[PDB]
Structure formats: C-alpha cells, structure tokens
Design an enzyme around this catalytic site. Structure first.
Site, PDB file in Angstrom:
ATOM      1  N   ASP A  16      22.137 -64.411  11.452  1.00 20.23           N
ATOM      2  CA  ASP A  16      21.649 -63.534  10.400  1.00 20.23           C
ATOM      3  C   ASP A  16      22.772 -62.580   9.985  1.00 20.23           C
ATOM      4  O   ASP A  16      22.826 -61.419  10.399  1.00 20.23           O
ATOM      5  CB  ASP A  16      20.414 -62.776  10.867  1.00 20.23           C
ATOM      6  CG  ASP A  16      19.712 -62.055   9.748  1.00 20.23           C
ATOM      7  OD1 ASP A  16      20.097 -62.247   8.639  1.00 20.23           O
ATOM      8  OD2 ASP A  16      18.757 -61.362   9.999  1.00 20.23           O
ATOM      9  N   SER A  76      19.116 -66.078   1.406  1.00 23.10           N
ATOM     10  CA  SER A  76      18.747 -67.479   1.571  1.00 23.10           C
ATOM     11  C   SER A  76      18.813 -68.187   0.241  1.00 23.10           C
ATOM     12  O   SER A  76      19.876 -68.234  -0.373  1.00 23.10           O
ATOM     13  CB  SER A  76      17.392 -67.596   2.222  1.00 23.10           C
ATOM     14  OG  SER A  76      17.148 -68.903   2.566  1.00 23.10           O
ATOM     15  N   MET A  77      17.700 -68.661  -0.298  1.00 23.40           N
ATOM     16  CA  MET A  77      17.825 -69.337  -1.586  1.00 23.40           C
ATOM     17  C   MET A  77      18.246 -68.337  -2.665  1.00 23.40           C
ATOM     18  O   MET A  77      18.857 -68.724  -3.656  1.00 23.40           O
ATOM     19  CB  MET A  77      16.574 -70.107  -1.975  1.00 23.40           C
ATOM     20  CG  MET A  77      16.302 -71.271  -1.035  1.00 23.40           C
ATOM     21  SD  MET A  77      17.741 -72.387  -0.779  1.00 23.40           S
ATOM     22  CE  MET A  77      18.058 -73.375  -2.203  1.00 23.40           C
ATOM     23  N   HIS A  80      22.008 -67.649   4.658  1.00 26.36           N
ATOM     24  CA  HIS A  80      21.202 -68.048   5.775  1.00 26.36           C
ATOM     25  C   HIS A  80      20.483 -69.276   5.353  1.00 26.36           C
ATOM     26  O   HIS A  80      20.619 -69.720   4.212  1.00 26.36           O
ATOM     27  CB  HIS A  80      20.259 -66.925   6.214  1.00 26.36           C
ATOM     28  CG  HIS A  80      19.597 -67.126   7.535  1.00 26.36           C
ATOM     29  ND1 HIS A  80      18.276 -67.510   7.689  1.00 26.36           N
ATOM     30  CD2 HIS A  80      20.105 -67.029   8.773  1.00 26.36           C
ATOM     31  CE1 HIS A  80      18.013 -67.595   8.981  1.00 26.36           C
ATOM     32  NE2 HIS A  80      19.104 -67.324   9.648  1.00 26.36           N
ATOM     33  N   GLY A 137      13.076 -68.100  -0.018  1.00 32.27           N
ATOM     34  CA  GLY A 137      11.899 -68.929   0.151  1.00 32.27           C
ATOM     35  C   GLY A 137      12.248 -70.356   0.486  1.00 32.27           C
ATOM     36  O   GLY A 137      13.312 -70.640   1.032  1.00 32.27           O
TER      37      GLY A 137
END
Lengths: 181, 178, 178, 181, 181, 181, 178, 181, 178, 178, 181
Positions: free
Chosen positions: J158, J84-85, J109, J55
């Site tokens: 990615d 990601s996070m 990412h 997010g």
C-alpha cells in the site's frame, strides 16, 4: 453449578461488560447479600469492564464503602473510566492488578437523569462538571493524588499500566504469574 | 404529478383547495397561496374549497388571519367536510359568498389542541389553548350571528349540521344546486 | 411519469379517470379536475371513465355534488367495475350519456362507512353514515327509475349486474360496441 | 439462590429501574407477601431509580402505608421524582440515604389512563395538576414542609444531596461509611 | 417461591395490566382452581388495571358470580372502565379500596369478535351499544344506581375517588392506613 | 403448580385464544392423555375463543367423539364460529353456558391446505362450500335443527345468547350464579 | 426517466407496450393510452406490443373492451410472452394484423381470478369469475376460429404454443422475419 | 408432565405442523428411542399435518420401516402430500383414520439440497421428477395401486376422504365414534 | 438525472446501451428503444454497446427478435462483459459490424432459466427452457460459423474468451484499437 | 438536483468527473459520457477529473478502452485520490496531459477482484482476475515508463505517492499550481 | 428425558441441520464426553444433514479419528458435501445407510476465516483449492478411490444412492427394512 455461581459461593463478584444502571443494582444486591451471609469475610471483586454509567457506578461505590466486610479488587483486563474508581475503592493493601491490565482515567460520560430537561445543554454540562468533580475527589481520597492532579490526567485520557497504577495510587500490588514450566 | 399539475392550473383560476389536516404544514402552504393570489391580482376574488376533518387550532388561525389581511374577497365552499377548523374557515369566508353543496357536512366542534412536551410544558400549552379556543368561539359567534352561549353548547358536543341546517344556523349563506 | 403524462393529455381532451379507491384523496383530485375542466370551458362535455371497486360514501358524495354543480354535461362510462360508489357515480352521469362497455360489471351495493375513533365516536359515526346511506339510496332510486324498496333489496345483497342487466335496470342508458 | 431472592428471604425489596405500571404490581405483591409472612418484622426497601409513572408509584405508596410492618427505606444512587415520595413514605426514624445519593424533586410525568381521550390537552393538563397536587401533599405529610414550599422547589427541579434531604425532611439519617483501612 | 405464587397459596389473585382476552383466561383459570381447592374460603382479588377488553372482562364477571367462594375485591391504584365492574362484582360488604385509588367509569372500548365483518360501522356501533348496556346494567345490579344514572356518568368519563366510589355504590369501605410513627 | 396444570389434574381442558392448527394438536393431545389416564371419568372443556381454523377444529371434533370419556362443555365468554361446533359436540345433557356467553354461528374462514394452488379462487371457493357443509351438518347432528335452517342463520352471522343457544340446541343448561350476598 | 421518455416518444408513433402484470393499474394505464391515441387521430392504426405473463381476468377484459370501442385498427405483436390475458389481447387484435415474432411464446391458459375477502365473499367472487372466464373462452374461440371445446381442452392445461404453432392455431396471422 | 410427554411414555409420537427438516430429526429420534426402550411394543403415530419437505419425510419413512416395533398410524385432521406416505407406511392392518380426516395426494414440493446450483431449473426439475417417482413408488408398495395410477391421481391433487382412503389402500379402517348419549 | 440525460442524448445519436441484467424489464426497455430508433429513421444504423453479465434466456430472445425485425443494421460492441445473453446479442449484430474492445471478455454460456412456481410448474418451465436453449445454441452456431457440437461443448463450461479469441471463434468481426 | 445540473453544464464544457467507486454502474455512466462527447465533437479534448478510491478491475478496463477508442485526446486530473483504478485511469490519459494538483494522492495498487458465487465459481473468477491484473500491470508499466517489476513491487504494497512523487514516477506529467 | 438425551445415554450422537461452526463444537464436545465415559464402547453417529462449513466439519473429522472408541455412522436422509466425509470416516465395517439415503459429493463451500482479507478473491480461491484437496484426500483415505477420481466426481456434483455409496467406498452396508407385515 456454573461458574459465576461457584464464584458467588466463594464470595466473588465478577464485574463485567454489563455496566448499565440496571446491572449496577445486581452488583449492589450481591454486595448486600454477601455481607449479611458473613460480615467478617472478604469479598473479592474482579473487574474487567469498559467503564459504565457514572451515576450507577457511584451507587456501587457507596455500597462498597458501606459494607463491613473488606472488599478486595482485582483488575483483569480493563478498568476504564469509572471502574477505576471502584478499583481504587477496595480496601488499601488489597487493590490488585494483572500485568496486562489497563486502568483508564477518563471523564465520565453523560447518563443518569437525562430524561429530557429543556435546557439540556446548560443542565447536562452542569451534570458533567459535578460528575467530574466526584470522580476526581473520589480518586484523590483513594489514591493520594490531589484532585487537581487527577483532573490534569483525566482531561488527557491517561491510561495506566498495572505498574503505573501503583505509582498513581490505584493498585497496591501487581500480581505475579505462576510459571510451572 | 397530475395532482400538483391540476392544482397549479386551478391556482391560476384563483381556486385554492383545503383537502386535509389543517396542520402547520398545510396552513403554511395555504397562507402562501392566499398571499400569492392576492399579490398577483388584488382586484379579483379567491375561491377556497374545503373538504377537511380539521386540525390544530393555531394552524387554522394562521390561515384565517391570512384570509383577512389579503385584500380580496374570499368565497368559501363546503364540498364534503368542514369540520372543526374546516368549519371555522368556511364560516370565515365573506358574507354572501359562503357556500355549501347539498351533501356537505358541517361540524362545529373544537380542536383538541394536542399534548406535547414535559408535564411542566403540558400545563402551559393548555392555557394558550384555552385562550385561542375562547377566541375561536367569539369569532364563530360573529360569523354565524349566534350568541356565544349557543356556539359553546354546540361546539362542545359532536353536533353535525346538514348543509340545509348549516345555512339556517348562519355558517353558510347559500346552497349550490344545478 | 408516463402515467401522469397520459392523464394530463387526456384531461385536455376533457376526459377524467376514476381508477381506484374513491377515498378522500381521490375524491379531492377528481373534484379538482371537474372544477378545472368546467372552468376552462363550460360549453363542452366531460367524459368520466370508471373502473373502480368503490370506497367511502362521503368521498363519493363529494364527487357527486361537484359533478352536479359543474355547469356541463358529464358522460359516464363503466369500463370494468362500477362498484358501490363507482356505481353511484356511473348512474349519476347525465341522462342519455351513461354508458357501459359489454364486459363491464356493475355492483349496486353499499359502502361500509368505516370504524374509527373511540367507542363513543364510533356510535356517532354510525348515525351520520346511516343518514348518508339513506340519501344514497334515494338518489339511486331516482337515477335508475326504481322504487327505493328495490334499491334497498338489491344494495343490501352482493348483487352484480352484467352490462346488459345494468342497462335494463336503469344504471346505464347505452352499451358501447363497435 | 441468587441475590434478590436472598434479599427477599431477608425481607428486602429492591426497587430499581423497572418502574412501569407492570412492575409496580410486583412491588405491591412483594409488600403484601412480606406482611403476611410476618406482620411484626421490618421490611427494607432499597431505592435506586429514575422515578417512574406517578400513578403506579402512588399505588405503591398506599400499599406501603396500608401494611402493618414497618418499612424502612434506603436510598442508594437515585430517588428521582416520584421515588422520593416512596423514600419519604418509610417509617419516620427509618428513612436513610448513602452520601452520594441524590433525591430529585420533579413534577410527575404524564402516564396512567392516557388512552386517547379527545380533549387530550385539557384532560392531561388536568391530570398533571392533580398529580402535582398529590406529590406536593404527600411529601408535605412526610417531610414537614408546607405543600406550597414543595411546589416552589418542585417547579425548579431541585436536587437534594443526602445531607440536604435531611434538612428538607426526606431522610432521617445519612449512612456512614465503614472504613476498615 | 416468588410473590404472585405466594399470593396464590394465600388465595389471592392479582389482576394487573395484562387485560387481553388471552390473560382473562388466566384469571378465570385461577378462580376455577381456587374454588375447587376449597369452596368455603374467600378469594381476594387485587385490582390495579387500565381497563381492558370488555368481552373478556365480562367472561371474568360471570366466573366470579358462578364461583361459590366469596370473592373480595381490593382496588389498588386503578380500576378503569371495565375493571370497575369486576370491582363492584365482589361480594357486598367486601368491596374495598385504598385512598388514592381511582375508579374510572368509561364506555367500553371496541374489541372481541371484530374480525372483519363488511359493515363494520353498523355492526361495531351495535356492539358498542350492547356493551354499554351490559356495563350500565351490571353496575346497576351491583351499585344500586339506576342504569340511566350510570349512563349519564359513563358518557362523561366520570372518575371516582375511593370515597366517592362508596357513595356511588362500588366500594363498601375505604381502607385505612396503619401509621406506626 | 400453576392453574391450567391444576385444571389438567382435575381433567379440565381450557380452550382459549390459541386456535391455530398448531394448538389444535395440543387440545387433541390433552384429550388423548386424559382418556388413557381414566376412560371412565368426565373431561370438562372450557371454551372461550374467537373461533379458529375450521380444519383443525374439525380434527378436535372427531377426537372428542372418538374418546370414551364423556366430555362436557362450558362456554365462558365466546364460542365463535367453529368453537360452537365443539361446544355443541359435548355429551347431551352436559352442554352448558354462563349467562353473558355468546355463541356465534358464522361461516368458517379460509384455512388449512391453502398452500398456493394455481386456481385459488375455484379451489378455495370449493373448500369453503365443503367447510360450510360440514359445519351445518355437524351442528344439525348435535342441535336438532335441519342443516338448511342452520345455513339460513349461518349466512346472517346469527349470534345467540346463552338462553337462545338452548332454544337453538347448542346448550342444555344456562349456569346459575351463586350469590352469597 | 429514460424509460418513460422512450415510451412517450413511442406513444407519439402510436405504439403501446404491455410489458407486465395486466393488473388493474396496468389496465387503466393501457385503457387511457388507447383512448388517447384514438382521440388524437382515429384515422390511424395503433400498434400494441405484448411481452407479458398475464394477470387478472377483469383487467384484461377492461383493456379488450377499450380496444374494441376505440375507432381504429389495433395491430398486436407477441414479442416474448403472450400468456393468459397476454394471449387474449394478442388474439383480440384485428384480423390480418395479429403478429408474432419467431421466438415468441403464446400460452393460452386461464387466469386464477384471485381469492380475497371473507369466506362469504370468496364464494361469490368465484361465481363472477366463472362467468367472466366462460366469456373469455367464447371470445378465444371466435378469435382463433376454433370450437370452444378445444379452447377449453387447451386452456385448462399449461399448453405453450411456439410462434409457428400459434399461427396454425389461429392466434396469430403472421410471423415477422427479416 | 404435560401431554406430548405423557403421550411419549405411552409410546405415542404426535406428528404435527412442524414438518421442517429440523423437526424430521426429532421424529426419527423419537422412533429410535422408543424402539430401544422396548422393541416388542407398538408405537402409535398420530398424523395431523400439511405435508412437509419430501426429503426429510422420506428419511422418516425409512426409519419407520427400519424399526422392529410395529408402528400404527392414525390420521387426525390432515395427511397432506408427503404425510400420506408416512400414513400408508404404518404396519398393514394398523393404518387408521377418523371420519373427517383428509388424505391429500399431491406432488412433493421443492426442498432439500437446493442450495444454489447454477442450473437450478434443469436440476430442480430433475429433483422433482425423482421425488415424484419415490412418492408414487412408495405409495404403490403400501397401497396396492400401480404407480401409474397414483401418478394420474397425484397430478390432479386428488383428496381422499377417510372412507375413500380405504378404497385407495392408505387406510385399513375408519375409526368409529363412541357416542355415550 | 445525469444518467438518464446522457442516455437520451446518446439515443438521439442512435446509440443504445445494455449495461445490466437482461431481465424482462431491461428487455422491454431495449425493445422499445430499438423500435423507436428504427421508426425515427430506418435508413441509419443503430449501435448497441454491451457490458453485461447476462440474464434470462427469454428476455434475451425478445431483444434478439426486435433487433432482427427492425429494418436497420445493428452494430454491436463488447465494451466489458458480453456474457451469456450478453454474448448472444453481441454475436447477433450484423456481419462486419460485430466489435470488441481489446479488454472485452466474452462468455459463451447458458442461462439458468430460473425456478419458480409449484413443483408441478417447475417441471414444465424446464421443458420450455430446454427448447429455448436448443434454439439459442443453433443460433450461436450460425452466428459464429461453428458446428453446434462446439457451441454445446463450450457453452456448457464456464469458458471465457479474450477479445482476440472471440474474434478467432467468430463472435466478433473486429477489435477496436486507436 | 443541483448536483446533476452542474454536471450537465460541465459535460457541455467537455468535462467528466469520476468521483467514486468505479463499479460497473459508474463505468457504464462514464463510458456513455466519453462516447457522447466524442460523438458531439471529435476535434476537441475531454477533461477527466478524478477523485476516487477505485473499484473493480473490469470496470476500470471498460472505461479505459472507451477512453482509447474515443477519437479525441483525454486529459486527466488527480484532484484528490487516484487510487487503484483511479490511478490506472489517471495514468492512461494522454501524454503531456496527465495532471495532478499539489495535494493529490496517487495510489498504485491492485483491486481485490471480489468473491461471488459458489466455491466452484470463485475458483474460476480468480483466474480471470489474475489475467486482467497482469494486463493492468503491463499497462501501468507502459504508462509510467517503468519496468514491470517495479510496478509489481509497488502495486503489491500500500504505497502512496505524493503528487510530486507521482510526477517523478511517471503517473503525472505536470503539477498544477497558480 | 426427551430423545436426543436418551440417545446420548445410549451413546448416540445425532448430527442434523445445525452445521455451523458453533454447533461443530457441540459434536466435538459430545465425542469427547462419550469417550471419557467409556473408551471401549461404540459411539453411533446418525447423519442427516445438508453439508455445512468445511472447516468445522474437518475439526469433527479429526476428533472422530482421535477418539479411541469405535464410531459407527448411519446415514439417514442426507449426507451432503462435507458430511459425506464424516460418514466415510466411521470405522470400516461400520459405515451404514438407509435405502433412500443420498450421499452428495460436492465441492466445499466458502467459510471459516473469511473475515475480510483485502485480496479476497486470490485468498478465498486459494482456500477453496485447499479445502477441495482435503476433501478429496480424506475421502480417498476412507473410500479407496484415488483422489483424482474423487475430484472428477466432485466437480460434477455426483449424487450417490445408498447402494452406489457402497461401490464408491463410503458405505459398507445398506440397512435392511424390517417388514412385520
């Protein structure tokens, strides 16, 4: 007049995305009118569509075979599922497709009189087997392939290129491009 | 929820309320409450308070059979409407314990059954309905002490009884005043 | 829910609030609360606080009969509106215990009954309504100590009473000041 | 002019998916107009529809029998439930169907004046028995089968093929295809 | 031109499912126009409808009686509730119905100026008794039955067949079918 | 051309259920156009409506009185609330109604510039008293009754029959029926 | 619900919050809380915290009469807005216990009453409104120690007072700083 | 042709309830077209409207003053807020109103480019003061009242009668009624 | 609700979270929590954790005055955003107890006030807004130790401070690392 | 709610789950849980289980700073996605306590930041985003023991890591098997 | 014919509130058609609009500069954001505005191909800087102000009056009013 209407004057029926039972009636109305206007002149049907209801596409199929004028069919873009029957249904020697056209042989989807019978699963599965039988049989009559072969390909969602469609018996010719430069 | 809190406190006093609909959901809730109270203590009475327009005939019969099998007297009270199945239930309480409040209104009438399904099913539901309704009328005749012919003459008309009339007719044994 | 928590704590102090609608759902909730408090301890009073525009005439009568059968005095207070059935209830509290706060507004008026069903049913609902309303007027005449003719002359007009006027008229026994 | 309007000029009524009481009135308006324009010329009605309200389809039935011009009927696609009555109702010798046409004999669905009578179950069940009686009776008058036979088939949702429909008395002929190659 | 418009040219008004106060005004506009075009020629009104608002159907009734041209009425399908008044209202000797037509005598439903009066139950019940009185009175004037008889039948939702409607005084004749084979 | 348009050619304005400020403008446009086409010929306005906004119906009232051509008014069906003013507003000797017509004198409803003033209760109650005063005053000028009498009847929702409307001064004549048999 | 949990814990500290609307629902909730706290212990004060744009005049009066009858001092605090009825309530706290926080904003203004019903009803609601409003102005004059003429001159304009001005005017007795 | 179109042929613009920026463009298009058709002939604008966006009504105002043909204005019904500017804007000697017309001087509402600026309160309040200044200034130029006087009345929602509007400088004459009986 | 359960457990540790909006509803919830914790034990500190984009200026001021009157030190933490009123609150914690986490972002900016009502009301709301905003700037100047001119130069631009910059500027006394 | 009941029981075992979104609401809930567990007992570890697509970058940083200030080791587990996070957090657990399950998938990412507001605001949000992202990359380089250049080469594509690869890369210290 | 169509006959394009990419195509179609009808005759474009998508307004800008016929521009009402570019874009000596016209120089809003790129913040911020650069550059070419000056004003939402717009280089003249009394 707008095209489509100019196309009708030229005896061209353009079959598009509107593939509901309600529109199948318009295609049949167009075929019936073009035949009465001049029974000896060819009707060209352009096909670019994501299939449609099988029941109403079979109604069009019978109208096309009923009509005295030759009907030639041209696949532009898509001729998915049931539209491939209508494509194959044109007069032999006159089934045509453009090079990036794709003919998709699929089992027919469930439609028609599916109003709400209690045993929907037994009945609708029976309708499906009947519809598959008609699609396989109808293509065999127009492609030269045994219905058993068609079933094997139908069950695997085989997609034909414009050239493969000739080998499979749906298309007689693949239309050339006309490059002027 | 104050509403549910009040009803749980009343359920512990062995008081059950029928305030609406008598549909399948309400009948299952009432059947569960009658069975629960009888299971907790079968030596004591259950008081059923009715204020309802009525509902499905089959839902009312489920409540009725539960009232009967439960091994405990059930007192019934009309505290507004006791219409259609609301009347059936009111009249089905035990003898000497059917009550109405003075401004209660009792409607002996029939349910409509309800039409669902295909034409083929509707034609069948109607037969089951006619059978259940015939039993409803037999039972109302027994509950009130009337000829079945009067039950039919009155239930087929939108005939409301005042609490005083309902007592004379036999739906109610007593009127509660203070 | 703070709102429901506060009302449960008040119900334990034997205080009941009628804050809206007087529809069938509200009447069943109030009837349940009156029956519960009387069941818990019939030697003590119940205080009913009213701030309501009113509602259905049959709903108000269900509350009224419950107030009467409950074996305990019920005090009533107008703490804003006591309109239509809100007035009926206010006036129906026991004698010497009907109260209004100084800025209370009391409206003696009639409910509209309400039109539902087919034309054939509407024509019938109207007769039951006329009967209930006639009883409402008789009872208001008895509650206030007025001729029934005045109750009709005033209830058929949108006539609001100030708390001071409501006392003179007989709806209220006392005005509460501090 | 678009087809449908060209079809009307040729005295052709096309009965499709629009089978509401509201559209039944359009079919009746078309029959009344074609008769007044020329009482001695045939009217062709094409049928491709998933039944419809029984009450309004009976209103069409009476109009068709009232009208002096012969009405011939052609089944394209579907003639479900109540549309099978209208198909059978055409002048004898002129009931026709295409080979993949399907005529579906079903009990009529509940419609018409079902506005909200209190005893809906007793009343609507009575309407259903009346409608079934009219469908069975009407088909018997036009098919030659006893109404009792029709009931036995109606109760089982019997679906007729274009050929079976001849044996059952709905269709006089099954239309041939005209293959030019 | 489409039918309906061809029907208007022939002095035919077709009264269908659109029975709102808004459409009652269209029927009245059609009657007023046909009378001015030629006061000495008959107007035919075809009726196929599930009743409608009583107030606006009485407005049509007065227009029909006001107009000098004879109005003949034909029941196709339904003539429920209030439409039965309009059917009975045609000139005597000219009230007609098809054999499967059904005339339904019902109490009028609640409509018209029901905007939101406070005492809706006392007022609307009064409007209902007034509307019932007008329906009973109006039918008695056009059928020959005492209004008291009509009330007894109205209260029981009596439904008349095309033949019963003659005995009841609504229809003068039941239209014959014209079978050519 | 459809009626309504034929009615306009005959100088007839038909005022129906569309009684919004938006449609009041159409009525005024019709009156302004008919006057310019021929200032010496009568305009007939047919009224069948459940009142409407008072503000926009007063705008029509002034237009009707402004226009040089006589305007005659005929009540068909309803002339509720505010439409009764427009009915009374026609030229004396030319206010007419059909026998089952009902003229309903009611206090005007709240509309017009009620956009969202803060003191809506003091302001809107003031608008109501102003509107009531105009309705009472306007009817007194056209009916002969003192405005005080009109107020007493207005406050009780008095409904007038076509005959009572003559006694009350709204209608000069009640139109006869023309029975040909 | 953290929000309701916090308010119940505060209610036990005899603190009541008025955070919005002052509509009939809010007034009934506040009236119930004032009555509850006074019933639990009438020897102790209740603290009312106000942060509200205001609302219906009749709702505000219901809260006010409840504040007065309750046998306990009520302290009031402006902790943001005290507008319209929010001001009425603020000013109605007892003397020596009306407070404002430094960035509080007090608006003496009038409610709009609200228009509902038919034209015939609107014309009547307006009279009851005018009567209630006249009493609101009399009471604000008494609460603040002003001539009624100033209350009208200021309440008929959208005149906001800063907390310091509100004190000078008499709405507030003290400003709370730390 | 329908009125409105007949009114345009007669050089009449009818300004109604459609007072959105989108419709302001139609009024301007009508003024631009009538001027080019014949620059020496008067344009009549009828006004019956609940104000509208101020920004787009000022765009109309400039077009009206730009155009060479005299524009006369007639208030029918309402001329609220901003429409009062357009009413005052007609050529002097030609501002007219009917007796029950009401001209409402109000502060202009917030509209125009209010797309979503961050400091909406400081910006929109600034737009409001600018719009009020233009309304007050524009009316002063056309009514003769000092802008300061107009502000005092504007702030109190002063509503003018057709006669008061003359004293206030918006209307030159109040139109007489033409009673023929 | 795990979310509310966690916050109640934290409230008992005297920890308050401001995670969003700072609208009137949030301000009333926070004001209630500050008052509650101070009432439970005024000898202990309250820790306020801020992660919020900000909101209405009047809502932020209600929270601020409550923070000040409460008789207990309030520590404040920027644990993400402290934007607009989120910054005002952060900076308003007591001295020596204003903290930021290293990746905190502090935005000194102004609220937009918000436009509601008729044109006549909008023109008035704007004046009250300008007055409140002037006080917001005075207070930020006092909280940070800056000339008011810098507060205006920076608050009128969308100028974000890193946690390290926020400390240098005076919004934060310490950065929390471990 | 079984779901919330299970998480409360797990929170008492010092287990925190991050199952979705990492938006501002989730970050505030997790920050509250980390602070709560550390407050209850700072001598014990907290286990954070991650199964999340990731997010907002600012939400992830709020969680990260809370994890760091909390005076207790935090173990992290990839039990599906750590994207990601979700990866940032996974990698941010303490050393020797970062775990992945064998079929875990780790995606290093970047967040997209997100575009909101007017064109004028979008152009500014992008700068704050670029700054936060640069810090995210610095921290991932420190967490994994990689050159920042590799973190950028991989985070801008990615590129999914299998649990075995994630360990080799340095996101994870151990793979959990049984 | 209605205005707008009369305006097109007179070679007038009216650019209003419909500022979607979909309508930008209509403006371009109108410019392309007017040029082919007569390349030597001026086209007048009236502008009254709340900006619009920047990408599609730049497409119009290039079409306007591509076209051989002079295009003159008149600002009525609004010329917000991007419409100010189109206003400035008219042939020098022919940029005109009415006195209450307002030209609003704003940064362009985000639109065009913003379909759902992953890095929406980096990409859309880049699109914004590109769009701002084009607006600043384009206005500098048509106003004479350095793009740096335009940026300073753009960033502050500067709103120009019709007179200020001359000083700023967008308008060559401010149109006079024509007062006849």
């Amino acid at each position: 007049s707008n095209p489509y209407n100019k196309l009708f004057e030229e005896r061209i029926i353009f079959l598009g995305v509107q593939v509901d039972d309600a529109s199948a009636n318009d295609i049949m109305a167009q075929l019936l009118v073009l035949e009465s206007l001049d029974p000896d002149r060819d009707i060209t049907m352009y096909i670019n569509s994501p299939g449609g209801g099988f029941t109403s596409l079979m109604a069009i199929y019978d109208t096309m075979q009923y009509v005295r004028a030759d009907i030639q069919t041209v696949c532009l873009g898509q001729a998915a599922s049931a539209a491939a029957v209508l494509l194959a249904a044109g007069t032999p020697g006159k089934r045509m497709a453009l090079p990036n056209a794709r003919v998709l042989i699929h089992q027919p989807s469930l439609s028609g009189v599916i109003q709400g019978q209690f045993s929907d699963l037994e009945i609708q599965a029976a309708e499906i087997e009947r519809m598959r039988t008609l699609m396989e049989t109808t293509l065999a009559r127009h492609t030269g392939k045994d219905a058993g072969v068609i079933r094997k390909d139908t069950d695997r969602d085989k997609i034909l290129t414009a050239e493969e469609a000739k080998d499979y018996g749906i298309i007689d010719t693949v239309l050339e491009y006309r490059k002027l430069s | 929820s104050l509403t549910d809190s009040v009803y749980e406190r009343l359920l512990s006093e062995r008081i059950i309320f029928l305030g609406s609909e008598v549909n399948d959901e309400i009948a299952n809730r009432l059947c569960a409450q009658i069975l629960l109270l009888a299971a907790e203590d079968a030596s004591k009475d259950i008081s059923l308070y009715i204020n309802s327009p009525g509902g499905s005939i089959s839902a009312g019969m489920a409540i009725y059979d539960t009232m009967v099998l439960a091994p405990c007297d059930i007192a019934t009270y009309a505290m507004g409407m006791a219409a259609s199945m609301g009347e059936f239930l009111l009249a089905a309480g035990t003898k000497g314990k059917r009550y109405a409040l003075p401004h209660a209104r009792i409607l002996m009438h029939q349910p409509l059954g309800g039409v669902t399904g295909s034409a083929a099913d509707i034609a069948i539901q109607a037969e089951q309905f006619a059978v259940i309704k015939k039993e409803m009328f037999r039972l109302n005749a027994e509950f009130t002490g009337q000829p079945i012919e009067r039950i039919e003459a009155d239930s087929d008309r939108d005939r409301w009884f005042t609490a005083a009339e309902a007592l004379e007719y036999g739906f109610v044994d007593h009127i509660i005043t203070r």
